[PDB]
Enzyme design. Structure first.
Site, short mmCIF file in Angstrom:
data_model
loop_
_atom_site.label_atom_id
_atom_site.label_comp_id
_atom_site.label_asym_id
_atom_site.label_seq_id
_atom_site.Cartn_x
_atom_site.Cartn_y
_atom_site.Cartn_z
N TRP A 110 0.86 -1.19 0.00
CA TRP A 110 0.00 0.00 0.00
C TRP A 110 0.90 1.25 0.00
O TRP A 110 1.84 1.35 0.82
CB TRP A 110 -0.93 0.04 1.25
CG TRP A 110 -1.59 1.39 1.29
CD1 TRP A 110 -2.69 1.73 0.58
CD2 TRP A 110 -1.21 2.56 2.04
NE1 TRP A 110 -3.04 3.04 0.84
CE2 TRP A 110 -2.15 3.59 1.72
CE3 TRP A 110 -0.19 2.83 2.99
CZ2 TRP A 110 -2.11 4.88 2.29
CZ3 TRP A 110 -0.11 4.12 3.54
CH2 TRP A 110 -1.09 5.10 3.22
N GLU A 114 -2.99 -3.10 -2.56
CA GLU A 114 -4.22 -2.51 -1.97
C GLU A 114 -4.52 -1.12 -2.41
O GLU A 114 -3.68 -0.22 -2.27
CB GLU A 114 -4.00 -2.41 -0.44
CG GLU A 114 -5.17 -1.78 0.34
CD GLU A 114 -4.91 -1.76 1.85
OE1 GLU A 114 -3.82 -1.93 2.38
OE2 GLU A 114 -5.99 -1.59 2.54
N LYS A 134 -6.90 2.45 -2.40
CA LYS A 134 -7.50 3.36 -1.43
C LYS A 134 -8.18 4.46 -2.22
O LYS A 134 -7.65 4.89 -3.26
CB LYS A 134 -6.45 3.94 -0.52
CG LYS A 134 -7.04 4.63 0.67
CD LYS A 134 -5.97 5.04 1.68
CE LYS A 134 -6.45 6.10 2.69
NZ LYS A 134 -5.44 6.48 3.70
N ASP A 181 -10.09 -3.23 0.99
CA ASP A 181 -10.22 -2.65 2.31
C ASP A 181 -11.59 -2.02 2.51
O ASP A 181 -11.99 -1.13 1.79
CB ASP A 181 -9.07 -1.64 2.58
CG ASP A 181 -9.14 -1.21 4.03
OD1 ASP A 181 -10.12 -0.68 4.47
OD2 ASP A 181 -8.10 -1.49 4.79
N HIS A 195 -11.80 1.75 2.51
CA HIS A 195 -11.16 2.54 1.45
C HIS A 195 -11.94 2.83 0.21
O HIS A 195 -11.28 3.03 -0.83
CB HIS A 195 -10.03 1.64 0.87
CG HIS A 195 -8.69 1.67 1.55
ND1 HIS A 195 -7.50 1.71 0.81
CD2 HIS A 195 -8.36 1.67 2.87
CE1 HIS A 195 -6.49 1.74 1.67
NE2 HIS A 195 -6.98 1.71 2.91
N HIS A 216 -9.32 -6.54 4.37
CA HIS A 216 -8.99 -5.65 5.47
C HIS A 216 -10.28 -5.10 6.02
O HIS A 216 -10.96 -4.45 5.28
CB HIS A 216 -8.14 -4.47 5.01
CG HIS A 216 -6.75 -4.90 5.00
ND1 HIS A 216 -5.79 -4.01 4.61
CD2 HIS A 216 -6.22 -6.08 5.35
CE1 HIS A 216 -4.64 -4.66 4.72
NE2 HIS A 216 -4.87 -5.90 5.16
N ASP A 265 -12.85 7.71 5.30
CA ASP A 265 -11.90 6.61 5.53
C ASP A 265 -11.23 6.85 6.89
O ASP A 265 -10.02 7.07 7.01
CB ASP A 265 -10.87 6.48 4.38
CG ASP A 265 -9.96 5.27 4.50
OD1 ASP A 265 -10.11 4.35 5.28
OD2 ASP A 265 -8.94 5.33 3.69
N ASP A 278 -11.12 4.76 9.70
CA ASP A 278 -10.47 3.67 10.44
C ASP A 278 -10.96 3.37 11.88
O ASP A 278 -10.17 3.19 12.81
CB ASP A 278 -8.95 3.88 10.50
CG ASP A 278 -8.24 3.56 9.20
OD1 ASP A 278 -8.43 2.55 8.52
OD2 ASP A 278 -7.41 4.53 8.89
N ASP A 314 -7.74 -3.65 9.89
CA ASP A 314 -6.99 -2.51 9.35
C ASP A 314 -7.63 -1.22 9.83
O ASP A 314 -8.33 -0.56 9.11
CB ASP A 314 -6.85 -2.48 7.79
CG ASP A 314 -5.71 -1.52 7.44
OD1 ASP A 314 -5.26 -0.66 8.22
OD2 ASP A 314 -5.26 -1.64 6.23
ZN LIG Z 1 -6.22 -2.13 4.36
#
Ligand SMILES: [Zn+2]
Ligand SMILES: [Zn+2]
Ligand SMILES: [Zn+2]
Ligand SMILES: [Zn+2]
Lengths: 401, 402, 403, 402
Positions: B169, B210, B212, B243, B246, B270, B278, B280, B310
């Site tokens: 990433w 990955e 995003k 993800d 993402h 993830h 985004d 998290d 993640d």
């Molecule tokens: Zn991720």
């Protein structure tokens, strides 16, 4: 005994976190869910196979659904559901045209809610009703809504519980609009006229409902979220919040506590929007659970009116009502089983760690056992066995329609 | 019988009635490890709310506290910045030996390890470009770091007997209106080819890429986009990393799993909770986490999927974050393992959408909780909120002195 | 005036006259629409308590004057309470008009109106993520006091400058994660604001406004002062309502809300900014929604009830440039709206002539408004085009560079 | 005239930024826009708004009036249901002959023709599955229809000396919660491989695949998703169709062009304006339309991109709809051609983000309109709003008799 054994284990478990399961069941009996008549005949009115074709069939369908849904219910009727041997112009409907609905409701211990029908009509063909620039057409809808209030009041007088009459109009434009103002000005004035007649609050409540967009009117909606939040606050009517009527990611659960500080009552229409105001059947999902939690956490028993507002014609209609209504009740039950005081305290102290932990742990407490007993107490199936009844009904009755 | 035993018996009967074997569900749950993210323990500091870990020892202690509260199989996902050397090591020159302690500890704790090159928070990542950097030397340094990283990863696989999945990433992108979205992508394409050119034993290492959608300060354009990497993994046959935090608003990776699996060999999933962005947040037992688990299980993806957390939340106790997230992912997987999929699939194939919707919703009120609690108990971990007490004790005793 | 500009202008004049649009009137109307420039973009929101940022009042004023000479027409300056000037530290709740005297003076000398804002962030007492809605009475009172004091500074501005100062109330209050009680903090906020606005001030000098936010980093799950909360607030208490273009849900647009809110609240404060994937606060571009907002203001003849302000913050490029680009774009959007044959479009719409409505709206895009914009710039002694950037670069070289 | 005066002034303003207005015009003529036939008859085919076309003659007549008001190169994109046969023709049995009148007219008007299999509004699409239908017989019918359509497409190319881009779009999906998203995707992938298995001359025919996020009454799951077709196009090397109305809220195809082009051989761009959904509203000269135009020109995609309209508005005059949309795409393209890209690129490459932004924004007030108007004059087409009068008059004379 399986159901009883599970219930007893559950009762101890919840007791350990300060929750009384018997009290939660009693509280659940204080939260009726208003079922929408229109799911039974695809919004046809009386002016997947098996839709109801008349009042008698719609009531037979409602009764089958009601027998499979535990606890209190109400029926939310639209004006087009009137029963008259002769045709009635929208602007002249009267209580007598809803007498059969009233008697039935009494017999079934149901309260009734109402709505003027400002759609599917020659006079709504241009996409404007109450905000129509034409004075006559506009007057026609104003009159229909004024008459509908009287029908609403009649319901309340006859049934012992006030009828909430929701006002929704499709008014808007499909494409880029030059004047978003004038139609709103006209809407404002018209509604003022609409609610001018003072009616007994014990029998009737006016509510207003916004939408973000509609097929064929996606660029502009006259009665927007802001237009109605302004209206409801300023005229003191109830405000209807529709779970499927907002922006992507936008949630009515958040809005409950903000609106309640300015409007006297709230009408919550639950439905599941999918990629659009698709009106899918309510599921026991994140947002339905968030709405139920906000209702219960703020002790909104007397200021909130819960209703279903979806429309799915791709599955058995009776099953749609059953699935949706049971889900709304399951979400309310889970909210009632929450150790709210404990969580509020942890939150007030900044213990965000414990708050998240405990909220997440609630999801694995045995609420299912409590739900199954609620079903048993109301002589309703606790699990998937209800589908069998729907299947049997489809075989005997619906297949012949 | 204890109450846990009684509830379990009830559930066992109830599920057997829909053709589901609860003991087998528990056995299947052990085939689905979850890779814990090392970086939540020290706020992504590396070793180049109060209590964050300050060095490898502390990080390992914290991980152990979380692991004893999380039932069943786990893995640890490490970042290159988590190397342990007495002397500084330039990123482009890390070696297996700089991860020996991690390996010895994973061995001792029955953990598989996963890896990631660290392409950020470095002087050479300051312009906001790394692998797609226009400057040849800067670009070469990241390429080299990535190549070296693959050898560390293969080393984990070689030593622990399970392949290490090394996820790639990068933050590469532009905050505002961009003129040339193409050249950075061309450079990225060429770089990754270079990065994955040393063939390593697939029994020990797997490469993943990955995407995003955007990141704070790189909001208008991201070099490694979804399309970029689905094209990359399909054409190069690397694993693809999806993800859950993402993507675009309303966008879901659960849907993507069955589509991507027809083109890429393996999937790295993830999980994290995007909140308004985004963001998290810690993974909850919610609609999408369940959706993800359901697709995994329904499509029998055991051997081609790698599941990992993640997210990163530094506003609550770190160990609690790992415990909550990991247990939530395991709860979702377990509920999917308890689904009477065959029957549902059959109704769906018949067009019985009424029964399909009904039965999906009725599954929500089946007694999966008793199955979960037995899983925890058998794995010698708390069945409920009592785990919080262990965390609190650890906080008073150890975290409070950091 | 060059002959090319004059020529382009005369062609445009005719062209527009042909659709019933008087270009000269459009420029006169553009002179009635000030844009309030945000002071905080000059120093990264540091206050006085990419390189070259301003570091004090003097530097901020100089930077603002550079921007001002490159932006045509009327402007105002929007100040935050942390921009106060005093030899020694002043507690937020004790601020006074004298702490803003040099601003006032400078504004008079520059023909600027001034707007204001209490500062409820970046402070020890906002550390918990709660201010006016804090459960702690002391903390709450500190912020109420800061707000009541701020109203006095605002009123002073309006008394001194002869144009009311709009004072916007924005607070960051909210929760990062799943929240148990969204009601209590809202009840506290309602009460706190009532206290804040209790002192009656001369509307000729001061206006109160409230601004919602959907979500803040670190406060993503719940925002106390939501859109509905303030819409109810402003309707009920009759304050102005602030609509922020970066502040809402995905695809949600303030242009649509203007005409709805105006039927219920006395005035509207419009904060223009560009959200990019989030309330990213990017510089305003001449783009679809900035144009939509301008069109709504102009169509509804909102000259006297709307207050237009910039509200973005971009620290990755030259700051003076950011103000120039943003302000010039807002004005260009305004000018295009002013050049629209609205009455004719309104009439087509009223007739259900949607074909003609869409067609004409789209044809306006290819009408020579550029020539009209360039003439407005020339008349105001401002660069008509890209040349302003040289000015910027020169100032960077000479001043910003040495910072 | 004022047109020419305005033009001269512009020629100078643009020559000052290194831009040659004459070269811009010449390049614009290298960018055809494929008009969609279905806007003229509400997607009825020949198997609010009054005046819709009712048969091939009417539609052709209507297309002609539109064409006279749109400057420059154009193409016509036809759907299989627009065949011309005295009797019914099963979809799986269409032949070149069924489109010969279209070929002849096209030849006469200097038009290229593009095509599409019609997998909707049919008894065999009623279950909401076509190429991914589990019933072998239904699936074969659709496979056969798509195979036959390829032959029609190749025929157009053979006849017109310009390849026909045959776009594959299917409505396949489920309205509600779905149990198995994998099986229909596996059937679709095999089905597509069969569909494109006959080799045809790339100079006469190109196969393209088009994803969709959701359809009304198929909102929960779309078999042919973005990832599905990115994997398909990358792996089988077909063109990929990117539709501006088919994605998530805030998702844009402009960004995807440079990513997808590194993996697929050609791109078909369908421009339309989604409003709250794939509402298929008329294309406006707006942010995203301009962004798409910019990506195409910036990357010199003349030969690998195919530009087409894909919207449908039945509430206003149909001819007007085509005129506004086509003129709008052309204006966007022209603006892109008048951009000082090299300079911009060089600023960006230097990190001068201030100047990049500043100059991007100043291009909006440069006099591109005078250049557009001259393009109109050079092609003997109305430069300004006068075209409406022509449509009005055609409606009066013609569209009124319907
Ligand atoms: Zn991720
Ligand atoms: Zn509703
Ligand atoms: Zn703002
Ligand atoms: Zn398309």
């Amino acid at each position: 005994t399986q159901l009883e054994q599970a219930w007893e284990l559950a009762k101890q478990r919840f007791a350990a976190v300060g929750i009384d399961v018997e009290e939660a069941l009693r509280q659940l009996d204080r939260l009726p869910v208003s079922m929408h008549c229109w799911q039974g005949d695809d919004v046809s009115g009386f002016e997947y196979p098996g839709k109801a074709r008349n009042a008698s069939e719609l009531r037979a369908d409602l009764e089958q659904a009601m027998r499979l849904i535990p606890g209190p219910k109400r029926l939310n009727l639209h004006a087009i559901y009137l029963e008259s041997d002769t045709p009635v112009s929208r602007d002249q409907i009267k209580p007598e045209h809803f007498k059969n609905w009233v008697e039935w409701a009494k017999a079934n211990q149901l309260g009734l809610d109402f709505n003027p029908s400002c759609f599917s009509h020659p006079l709504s063909a241009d996409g404007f009703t109450l905000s129509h620039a034409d004075d006559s057409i506009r007057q026609f809808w104003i009159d229909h809504c004024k008459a509908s209030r009287r029908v609403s009041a009649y319901f309340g007088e006859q049934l012992g519980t006030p009828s909430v009459m929701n006002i929704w109009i499709p008014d808007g434009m499909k494409d880029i609009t030059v004047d978003r103002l004038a139609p709103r000005q006209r809407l404002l004035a018209a509604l003022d006229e609409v609610i001018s007649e003072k009616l007994n609050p014990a029998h009737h409540i006016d509510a207003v409902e916004s939408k973000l967009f509609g097929i064929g009117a996606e660029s502009y909606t006259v009665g927007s979220n802001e237009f109605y939040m302004g209206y409801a606050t300023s005229r003191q009517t109830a405000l209807c919040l529709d779970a499927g009527h907002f922006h992507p990611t936008e949630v009515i659960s958040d809005k409950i506590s903000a609106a309640m500080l300015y409007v006297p009552q709230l009408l919550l229409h639950v439905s599941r929007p999918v990629r659009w105001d698709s009106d899918h059947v309510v599921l026991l999902d994140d947002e339905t659970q968030a709405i139920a939690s906000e209702i219960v956490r703020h002790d909104l028993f007397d200021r909130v009116h819960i209703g279903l507002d979806f429309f799915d014609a791709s599955i058995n209609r009776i099953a749609a009502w059953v699935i949706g209504t049971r889900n709304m009740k399951k979400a309310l039950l889970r909210a009632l089983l929450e150790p709210t005081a404990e969580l509020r305290k942890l939150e007030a102290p900044g213990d965000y760690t414990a708050r998240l932990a405990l909220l997440e742990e609630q999801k694995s407490l045995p609420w299912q056992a409590v739900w199954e007993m609620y079903c048993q107490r109301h002589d309703t199936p606790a699990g998937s066995e209800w589908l069998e009844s729907v299947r049997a009904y489809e075989k005997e009755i619906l297949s012949r329609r």
